[PDB]
Amino acid sequence: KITFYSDKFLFRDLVNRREASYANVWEMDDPYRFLQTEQDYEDYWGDNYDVYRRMFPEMIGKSGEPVQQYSQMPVWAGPHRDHANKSEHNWMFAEIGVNVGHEPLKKLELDPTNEKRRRFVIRQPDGSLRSAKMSEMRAWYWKEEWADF
Amino acid sequence: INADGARVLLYPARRIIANFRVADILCAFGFQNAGCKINLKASNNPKAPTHTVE
Amino acid sequence: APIETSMRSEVLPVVIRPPTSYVPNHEVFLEKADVHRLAPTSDFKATFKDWNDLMTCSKRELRTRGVPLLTRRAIRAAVLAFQNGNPPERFDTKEEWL
Amino acid sequence: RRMPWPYDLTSMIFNQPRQGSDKIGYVVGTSMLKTAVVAANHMVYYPKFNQRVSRTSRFFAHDEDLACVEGDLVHIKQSRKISKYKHYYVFSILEPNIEGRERLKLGLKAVPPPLF
Amino acid sequence: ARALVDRKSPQLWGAPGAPIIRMRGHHVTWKFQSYDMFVEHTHRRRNSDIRLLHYLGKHCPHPQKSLWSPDTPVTQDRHLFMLTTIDVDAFKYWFGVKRCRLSVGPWNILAKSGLLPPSYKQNSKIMPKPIFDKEQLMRYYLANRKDQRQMEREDYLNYKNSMVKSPEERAAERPVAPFL
Amino acid sequence: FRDAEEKRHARDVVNELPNPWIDYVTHALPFPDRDAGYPDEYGDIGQWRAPGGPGSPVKGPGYYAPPMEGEHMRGYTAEWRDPEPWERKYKQ
Amino acid sequence: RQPSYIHDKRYGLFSNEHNIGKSRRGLPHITPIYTKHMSLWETDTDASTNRFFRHYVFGQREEHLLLGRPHGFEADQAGGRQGDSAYELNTDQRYKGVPRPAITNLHYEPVWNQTLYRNTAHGNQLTNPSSKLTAAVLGPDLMEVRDIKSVEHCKAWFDRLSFLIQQHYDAVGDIGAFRSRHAQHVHEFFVAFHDALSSFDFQDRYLYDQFAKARPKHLEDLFAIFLEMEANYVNEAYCPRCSLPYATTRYCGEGDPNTPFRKHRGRWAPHQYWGKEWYDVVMRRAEALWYRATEDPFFGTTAHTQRQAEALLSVYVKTKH
Amino acid sequence: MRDPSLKILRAGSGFQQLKRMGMPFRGADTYSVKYCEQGRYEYQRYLMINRFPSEYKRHFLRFLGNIRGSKSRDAVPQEALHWLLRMIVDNFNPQHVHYIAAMRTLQDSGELDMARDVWKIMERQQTWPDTATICAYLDVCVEAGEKTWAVEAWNRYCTELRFLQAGEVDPKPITR
Amino acid sequence: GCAKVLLDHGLVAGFRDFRNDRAFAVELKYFQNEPTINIIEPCSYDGKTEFEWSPKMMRRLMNAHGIHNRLIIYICRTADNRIIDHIQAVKECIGGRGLMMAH
Amino acid sequence: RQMRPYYNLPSKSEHGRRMTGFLTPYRHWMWKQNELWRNVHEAQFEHLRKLYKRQWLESFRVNADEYIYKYNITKSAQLAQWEHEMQGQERKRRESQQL
Amino acid sequence: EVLREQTPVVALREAQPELFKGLAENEKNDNIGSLSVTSKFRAEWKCQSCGQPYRATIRSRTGLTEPGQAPLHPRITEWSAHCPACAWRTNMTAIGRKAQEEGQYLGLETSLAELTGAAAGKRIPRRRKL
RNA sequence: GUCAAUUGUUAUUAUUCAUAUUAAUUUUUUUAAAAGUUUUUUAAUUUUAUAUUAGUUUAUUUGUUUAAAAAAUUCAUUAUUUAGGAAUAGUUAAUAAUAAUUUAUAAUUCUGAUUAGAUUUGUUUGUUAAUGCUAUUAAAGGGGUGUGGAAAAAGUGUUAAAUUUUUGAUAUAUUUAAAUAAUAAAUAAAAUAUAACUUAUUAGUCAGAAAUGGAUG
User: Fold this and answer.
1) Cα(K58)–Cα(K56) distance, integer angstroms
2) Which residue is nearest to nucleotide L152 (CA to C1')?
């Protein structure tokens, strides 16, 4: 960066140091004194996958919304038209609205808890109605780039 | 800057941006993120090349 | 790029009806299908070989044999409405129009 | 390009139920009956210049009791079509030209005549 | 109405009719073609959606391949997917409240999603229309008809107002000794 | 037709599962629930702003002191009325 | 562009369609849409909030020029204003105008503003699949019935693999007129099966919940089986790049159409014998799984198994390393 | 040569921006995480709209037409409540005619709890109901059979109501 | 207020409010016998135009091809009439009209 | 689209339409059958049309519930601040009155 | 196609020889019989009734499919046992027969055929409604 | 709160201005297209309402049931072109269901009116890094028995449209209108249904990629 810090900018950083207290010496020279928040811990340890897999289990997610089947609509037409529900191509249906469908709220637009979860239904070719699993839903939003450097 | 005969501007960029001549005058100079436009006319001008340099 | 598919017959068995006694022939049934003169169904009767010939003729196949669009329209559901329960009962309207 | 600038005097003082609903201006003409000609300012903002100028226009308004004397400040509003050109009525007069009534009380015109 | 009838666009019941859900194609080749579902009044004006009340969604006629799925081979129900997005919110309004029309062109698609039953023009040619007579249907209506009282609770709940305050809920909105 | 279609409905266990697309309507009002990346007052794309900035509707005052002639001692003390093994470093 | 819900809030909910219903409407000049950011409205917002009002020279100037406020071209107050006018300076404006609206009291006394209805009493009592209310009303019985596919999907996933393990057990054997078993086929499917579990783009996490109940105990050590496979494929009979005899078939890739040696313009390459390099590629291919056996979060076990140690030791002895 | 930063910082109100203000790359990664934080409808500010002096009454009548017209045959008893909301949603403060029109229509339709909902709405809107309106809610409270309701509404709104004493003058003339 | 800001950034040695209505005094500060204030320019060459600055219109300036660059100093008069440098102006994320630049 | 079958009631007049729209007394019965199949299939609508119209109403009553509930939080906040600005203002009119 | 040989289904020869013997003599019946009964192979056939060949895939006339495959029309076994044009009469002779015998047709025979009993109806655990 | 970024070889200097790219006319067979609307008991009567003109810049504005289908109006504000610029005129307003000869003197106009010239009034383009420059609508032609709910009413077609389901196995129709075709323009072949032109080519050769001879004078 090209910031121009004042001539006395670290004064508060100084009277902190010039008045620090340490019970045992190792506390004073500990190697992780640099680490204050989790935002620090995630990066410092982001190198050794070993502790990174074991300290942060939530990073490797294993809980997805189970694909849940929805009941159909009982059609009064009798079996005379009930052939149409069964078909060749499993139809994909997603919800659009002035409320829901926007990129920024995607992490809320598919929240498994939000009562306003954007509605995604796949009519399976047999005729059953099932919820689309998370992979297809996101495809209705635009793509995103991601790779482990 | 207005060196007599021209009004030259130098501004930052992601990379070298200039005509074929001014490309090297920055590149053979050693700049990397430079960007220049020589007044787009160099107002006080006959057709002369040194005004592009000075 | 493996992609299976339920063939169009397996979603619904496409079986074609035999001629009813009123239009029991390939020709007389097409004679029933000139509702407006723009569809000359009768002079295109010979183009198809028999009853079962006309029934399976497709958009590409009807077209390739030279069937013009209005006929490509009118000849179609004469088969279809017949499959569904409406045999081609339609009083020709040429004279009144003309 | 000259685009209409709604943010102005009349917009800032009065909540306008719709565009140009109410207006405010000086009573330029009271020659006509029950009709006080007013000159008010409707703004135009130049995006090219980035400076906005004022283009002043003439509106008619209907004062029932002939209350508007030349040189008054009126707060008019729009209304139903009264004539081919009146759709305004003098909702209220803010600044009455005291002289205008008194200079009429003497027996003269509410303003000295123009020069040209 | 006009001595010269608008021939290539004849529509029923004068103008300007109530909304009708329609299928407007954007005129390109079949490969590039993708229709729309949109609430518009009956007549179409030449200003090309000048009269569009609301835009419901988009349908793709071409059968697309796996929509970036994990390429799941084991389901075997991985046929060519047909994408279609629909504004359930607006449709629940226009269909239900403003009683718009419903054209078959789009309606077949909506039936697939679960909103609606198969359209009429969809004809299961193997299963013809049945025969009807009042007599044998009486005995059924005589055999198994819901009770009048229970049914009165059904249609009322099914149609008028689902939300009914239970005594427990009622026991909450009862005020309290400070101002009771 | 209706009964014998509801009756056959009363047998299949795939039914009796609340289908979201039938049960209800997600949102009825024409305006969305929350601001979703739309152009701001300054014309910039929602990528360049964060909802809830200074243009957010004012949160409002906390107390209520109508007059300048607000004279009561023992007041102005009613605004503020402020085990566990915390880690030493962090509490620092 | 500005959204359209701006239209409704200013005028009225669904005021649009009523206006559309006009007979003579839109021809030729329509009544355009009032889409103006809520803070930029002409009327409602004051000066301190609407930036445009903060204009001075032709804006606030005329005001103070009218109100009598001492105004300058630039000063300390909001817009070109220096001091109050005689009126503001002398008259009390706290309670002049509209009375203090009663709804203000709602702020300091907020118990009044309360949601009368439960947001879940809208018809969505079970839209949350994991809620307590959901499992309660659904009951434990129908609860699995909602997700028989999520179990069927996950279970059928493995029974693809458990079948592949057996079919392509030993890669040297042939399964066609030119078709052979190979180690890649099980892997690229498994990777794809690991793709579903682990990826960010092809993202499916629900499958792991069903692993405990859809696992084949025949595959509790998925990776020892993987290593038990290369030990079969190490045989020197068939091309290590080809899984065909390096003598019988001259050029590889003809026999399995998916082989990537053929592209839009991809030609062929000769066969090869089992050499140190094609001993080494197996080694790294044997290695890569070994570390993965424990580091793989979804499939790999926590620590190595007696089946694993002897399996890799097999590949080593066979590859002559 | 004039600064390029000026050539941008000068035309900030460039008519390109004016279109995006409405005055006359795109993935989820770019959009801020702080987006999902805004609670429901917090993004909306206050709105103080002035409507035409006449249209204050016309708009009220159409609302008065639906509420007292909802219970005709088709529109649900609930509908009378749904029209009271569409008014309030659009900032038309609901007047006492639109309250009585709801309680009357709702009671006629056997809806008692919903008839109280209209009363809580005007308790939420912090609108003090006049005596004519106070008696209305008590009327549904009679059908409701709840002493707990009327006692509550009693203390809050109709506490100081006193009978016209013989010495007091008569119905007060208009003072507002 | 501007000199108050330039001072805290060091482009001037030190201002003083003599409380004279007409004019106050600011001490220039030179380095290498070259004035610290190379290019200082008023934003609006004319008083009639008063350009306002979005909290993003400033933020784009801090980034010269990917490097957070606080070299130039722009002064903004906030709506609350706080004379604020563009640096703090983006810090609390509030806009204002643009008075001048200096660098 | 009204259809004109061949055995439909004919009219032997050349001044206008030749075929008449007066059914055969069987075409009445096939009709009452084929018309019924519509009624058989159509009465689902007025059932659905009442259902969807019911939800949307209850939708509007629970969604706008939160909205009016939240909008009230804003207006109560915006207003309590405005009466507080005139408060923060009136002290200035006082001190400037002192000046 | 996606599950090339993943289905454990047995061939037609061992399972149903009569269909295998019903096949039109394509001269490769030793090969056609070896395919599974479920396969999607659009095999030719002979008119059991109409003395002609007709093209109907193996599973169609068979009526059997694998779990995971989208089930066919459950009444196909008859539709493709008969050559298509010559087929129409078969499935229409039966229903028209029992139609006139009472003058009554209702397609709802499936519901009563679906109805194993009110005991079987309770295989649904219904939800605790609110 | 995730994308502003400028590429002419000049010719003393001053002055946006020859030879550049982008986008267009040049520029070429791959989207049109012909007639016969149609009912009806009454020689009749129901149903069949805005591309293509001529000349407009203070301009064009709206429905009682028609339909749908089971107390909502005739008004308006704005914005309006000519290089060199002066008057306009069945007038204005008030009466009123007056006013062919009532009552005022009024009304427009240099803040550029009226007549005259060009232009169909623009969420549409192109150029650009961009305030800008630079396009665009297939669209209302007075009144004279007044119909009709609305004049939109002797060219001007094409929409699955016109009161029995005519018909959707269709998207194909060949002469007058827009609508960017040199579509791997040159090496391994078309998971085709085999139909399209057919050969489908030009420029440069002082300056600056690249020339000698032959004439010329």
Assistant:
1) 7
2) E2
